[PDB]
Amino acid sequence: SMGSQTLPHGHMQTLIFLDLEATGLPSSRPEVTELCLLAVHRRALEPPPVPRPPRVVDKLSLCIAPGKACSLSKAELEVQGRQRFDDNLAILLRAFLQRQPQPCCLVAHNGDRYDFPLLQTELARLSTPSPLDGTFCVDSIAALKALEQKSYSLGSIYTRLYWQAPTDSHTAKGDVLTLLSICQWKPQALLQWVDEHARPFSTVKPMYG
Amino acid sequence: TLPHGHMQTLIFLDLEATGLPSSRPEVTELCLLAVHRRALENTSISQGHPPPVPRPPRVVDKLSLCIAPGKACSPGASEITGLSKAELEVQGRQRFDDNLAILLRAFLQRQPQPCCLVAHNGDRYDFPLLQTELARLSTPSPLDGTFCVDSIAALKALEQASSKSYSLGSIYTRLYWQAPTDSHTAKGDVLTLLSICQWKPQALLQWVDEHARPFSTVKPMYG
Questions:
Q1: For residue B27, what are the contacts with CB-CB under 8 A and spacing of at least 6?
Q2: CA distances from B91 to A72, A190, B102, B142, B174 (A)
Q3: CA–CA gap between residue B27 and residue A61 (Å, rounded)
Q4: Which of A1, A28, A94, B167 has the most CB atoms lying inside 10 A of its own CB?
């Protein structure tokens, strides 16, 4: 069966649920102000109560000072001493990804239209090769539209699935956990959709140059 | 005068490990919450008896890593968490290695300095064990310029000023009249530790400033 149809890039061994905050919308040429990652091995994914997070999870959450003000705030990030999106941050990201079993796939809500192009732009500014260049990515809006076979905001999906209000809405810290919960609704089905739709992060076009 | 100046970042730290010290344990999970001094200082003043549990600051950096040990956990060491050696290996975790030190260093370098680790029983357990893990590596210590303090002594001082078990949960329940969430896990307890340290953040910061010592002076748990 499936003689001509195969996964594009094999089974993904790590899913990295990703959310970010930024100074504004694309035409403003925005900068990332917060980045939150939750890295889960596929085995941790191999009304309904809200699933508890897997016991083995790697997490990274960083606040990042932008060069220009938001439409978080630049001034408050600066009085908390936050540093820019820089080479040391790339070292950190590279070392964090290196601890994950490969292939690794980012999962971000609206990542295809926002988070992934923005991250591509931020990483392009740095001297060192992008640490995401061997990683894959998918957009969880597409995933949940496929699985629910309607708003596709993160909070609306969570309430539609779990019939209770989400926690800490519209913050990267809270929303990345909400994203994980939504992806644990049908975890085997989610993994299969991710395997089938993962694409190389290197093919993501920068938001701006 | 202050031994090492005013601390600009507090890094609340907890870890899971394979057993008690005589078992020559290894770290299986490391959880850090880095908070700038100003973020702690801006915490809403505790008022009322009990005061509300403080909300975590809006700006916190977080790192949480699971680590495969070389040896199995002791009986009952992974009960509450489920972080056995077999499970960490099933989920692809790597050992405590040079790349992990590089990761920790880059995380620390994003924090304003001077930076001070804060861990409950850190002087007798977390800090010596981390020193041992780092001593095996080929990198410099990533904690070479970082300070540390134990929050048991800190909260003993702060509760005596406002006035008895000093386990993390006992302190938190005494302060907030609520049971801590996800008790007796590094992931849960590091947040409980932050909440206790937000009770009286000005007095806590003053105590930390006066008692901070270099992590490099911490003696290894074992060699």
A1: B15, B16, B17, B67, B69, B96, B129, B130, B133
A2: 35, 18, 22, 26, 38
A3: 21
A4: A94
Cβ atoms of residues A13 and A42 within 8 Å: yes
Chain B contact present for A82, CB below 8 A: yes
3-state DSSP assignment of residue A125: coil
Q: Report the distance separating Cα B10 and Cα B188, nearest Å.
A: 18
What DSSP state is assigned to residue A133?
A: T
Binding residues of B: 14, 16-17, 125, 189
CB within 8 Å: A88 and B111: no
Nearest alpha-carbon partner for A108 in A163, A209, A207, A35: A35
Task: Please name the helix (run of DSSP H) or strand (run of DSSP E) that holds residue A106, with its range, or none.
Answer: strand A104-108
Residue type, A169: S
CA trace torsion B136, B10, A87, A109 (10° rounding)? 110
Element (H, E) at A107: strand A104-108
* Structure-solving method: X-ray
How does strand B147-150 pair with strand A14-22?
A: unpaired
User: What strand order describes the sheet that includes A32-41?
Assistant: A199-200, A136-139, A104-108, A14-22, A32-41, A58-63, B61-66, B27-36, B9-17, B115-119, B147-150, B213-214
Rounded to 10 degrees, what is the CA torsion of A147, A150, A152, A153?
Answer: -140
Resolution, rounded to a tenth of an Å? 1.8
Q: What are the φ/ψ torsions at residue B29 (nearest 5 degrees)? A: -155, 140
